[PDB]
C-alpha cells in the first residue's frame, strides 16, 4: 500500500460515495414545501466536498507517471542496471581483497610480537 | 470534445411531482370548499349498542305477510 | 479438511522406493476453486466482457481526466433525470452509465500497476547499485586511514632505533 | 441509511475529507507524441538511458512543480490545489521498502 494509487482508487471510490450520501441525504431530509436552513446547509457542504474530492483526483492523475516511459524504457534500463551492478560487485570484491590481504600481514606480525614478548618473559 | 456518454435529457417539463397537481386535476374549488353529518342529518331527524350492531353490520359487509302476521292488542 | 494418506503411505520405506517430485504443469490447475491457468495477462482487458470507450490512442492521462469530468457531468445529468422525469427509462441506463465509466476508471488505474512494479524494480536496482559503491568507498577510506596509521607508527619506529 | 443525523452527517464529513485530503500544482504535461517502443521507435541507444539515470525527466523520473521543487519517484509530495489551509499529500509511488 501506501502509493499515489492507492489514493487514485480511494479517492474515486470516495467520490462514488458522497454521489450516494448526497443523494440519500437531501431526498431523505428537506424542508416541506409552500405553494431547512440545516438542510442548505447541508447542500452547500456536500457540493463543497463533491468539487474538492474532484480536484484531488485531477491532481493525483496529474501526478503519476506519463505515457513515456513505455515498458521498453523499463526494461532497457534495467539491463544497464544489471550490467552495472556487475561492475560495482567486482569492484567491491577487489578492495575487500586488498583489505583482507593487508588485515592478515598486520595480523600474523601482532602475533610474532606477542609470542616474542611472551618468550622474554 | 463530447465526453463520454453524453446523452439527450427528457422532455422539459412532463408530469412531475413539482406541478400543482390538485389544480392541474380540478379539484381546487372542492378543497377551497373544504378547508356532523350526524348533525347535518339531525337537522331532519331527533338525534345522531345495537346502533353498534348497524356499524359492525357496515364492517361485514311477502309484506302484506309481514301485516298480516303482525297481530299484537294495543294496551 | 484432510490429509493426503496415500503418499504418506507411500514414502515409509527405504532404498530408493521412496517417490519423485511431480513435474511442473504449464497448463490449467485447479488450485483452491477457481481455475488459475497459467499465461495469462495480468491485466484481463475490458473488451473480454464489458464495453470500451476508448480508441487506441489511449494516452491514459487524457482519457483519465476525461472520465473524471465525465463522471461529474453524468452526475449532473442524473440530477437532471430526477428533476424532470424520475419515472423515465433513462435513468436505469443512466444508473448503469456512470457504473460503466467507473469500471474504465478503475480499469486505467490498474493498467498503471504493472508498470509501477516494473519501476520499483528499477529504483531498487539503483539504490542497490549506489549502496554497493558507498560501501566501497567507505571501506576505502578505511584502508587509506589503517594505511597510514602503520605508516606513522612504522615512522616512529627507527626514531626510538 | 433508514436515517443521518447532524452527528453521524458530520462524521462523514470528517472521514471522507481525511481519506481524501496561488496555487502550488505540478507543472502540466502536454501529451507525447515520441515513446520509445512504440511511438518514435528509437533503436536501443544510450542518450535515453542517461537521462533516465542521470537528468531530469518530469515524465519519467519524477514529478515536477510550481515553485521549482523537484520530487522523483520515492518522495512525498506536499500540494495544496485549494486556496484552504488544507494541504493534499500524495504520498510515494515507489514506496521502497
Given at each position: 500500500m501506501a502509493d499515489r494509487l492507492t489514493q487514485l482508487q480511494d479517492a474515486v471510490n470516495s467520490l462514488a460515495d458522497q454521489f450516494c450520501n448526497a443523494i440519500g441525504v437531501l431526498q431523505q431530509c428537506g424542508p416541506p414545501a409552500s405553494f431547512a436552513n440545516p438542510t442548505e446547509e447541508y447542500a452547500q457542504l456536500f457540493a463543497a466536498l463533491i468539487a474538492r474530492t474532484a480536484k484531488d483526483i485531477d491532481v493525483l492523475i496529474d501526478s503519476l507517471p506519463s505515457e513515456e516511459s513505455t515498458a521498453a524504457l523499463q526494461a532497457a534500463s534495467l539491463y544497464k542496471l544489471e550490467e552495472e551492478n556487475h561492475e560495482a560487485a567486482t569492484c567491491l570484491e577487489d578492495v575487500v581483497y586488498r583489505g583482507d590481504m593487508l588485515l592478515e600481514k598486520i595480523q600474523s606480525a601482532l602475533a610474532d610480537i606477542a609470542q616474542s614478548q611472551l618468550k622474554t618473559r | 470534445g463530447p465526453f463520454y456518454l453524453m446523452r439527450e435529457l427528457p422532455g422539459s417539463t412532463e408530469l412531475t411531482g413539482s406541478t400543482n397537481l390538485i389544480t392541474h386535476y380540478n379539484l381546487e374549488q372542492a378543497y377551497n370548499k373544504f378547508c356532523d353529518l350526524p348533525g347535518m342529518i339531525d337537522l331532519p331527524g331527533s338525534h345522531d349498542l345495537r346502533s353498534l350492531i348497524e356499524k359492525p353490520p357496515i364492517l361485514s359487509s311477502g309484506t302484506m305477510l309481514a301485516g298480516f302476521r303482525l297481530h299484537t292488542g294495543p294496551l | 479438511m484432510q490429509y493426503i494418506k496415500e503418499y504418506t503411505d507411500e514414502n515409509i520405506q527405504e532404498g530408493l522406493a521412496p517417490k519423485p517430485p511431480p513435474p511442473i504443469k504449464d497448463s490449467y490447475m485447479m488450485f483452491g476453486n477457481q481455475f488459475q491457468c497459467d499465461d495469462l495477462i495480468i491485466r484481463p482487458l475490458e473488451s473480454q466482457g464489458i464495453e470500451r470507450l476508448?480508441?487506441?490512442?489511449?494516452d491514459h492521462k487524457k482519457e483519465l481526466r476525461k472520465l473524471n469530468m465525465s463522471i461529474l457531468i453524468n452526475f449532473l445529468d442524473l440530477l437532471d433525470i430526477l428533476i424532470r422525469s424520475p419515472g423515465s427509462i433513462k435513468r436505469e441506463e443512466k444508473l448503469e452509465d456512470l457504473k460503466l465509466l467507473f469500471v474504465h476508471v478503475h480499469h486505467l488505474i490498474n493498467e498503471y500497476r504493472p508498470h509501477q512494479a516494473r519501476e520499483t524494480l528499477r529504483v531498487m536496482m539503483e539504490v542497490q547499485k549506489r549502496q554497493r559503491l558507498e560501501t566501497a568507498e567507505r571501506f576505502q577510506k578505511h584502508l587509506e586511514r589503517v594505511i597510514e596509521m602503520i605508516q606513522n607508527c612504522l615512522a616512529s619506529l627507527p626514531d626510538d632505533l | 441509511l433508514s436515517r443521518n443525523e447532524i452527528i453521524q452527517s458530520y462524521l462523514s464529513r470528517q472521514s471522507s475529507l481525511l481519506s481524501s485530503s496561488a496555487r502550488q500544482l505540478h507543472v502540466l504535461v502536454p501529451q507525447s507524441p515520441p515513446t520509445d517502443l512504440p511511438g518514435l521507435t528509437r533503436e536501443v541507444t544510450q542518450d535515453d538511458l542517461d537521462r533516465i539515470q542521470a537528468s531530469q525527466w518530469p515524465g519519467v523520473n519524477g514529478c515536477q512543480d510550481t515553485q521549482g521543487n523537484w520530487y522523483d519517484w520515492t518522495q512525498c509530495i506536499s500540494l495544496d490545489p485549494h486556496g484552504d489551509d488544507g494541504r493534499l499529500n500524495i504520498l510515494p509511488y515507489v514506496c521502497l521498502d
Open positions: - | - | 476508448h480508441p487506441m490512442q489511449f | -
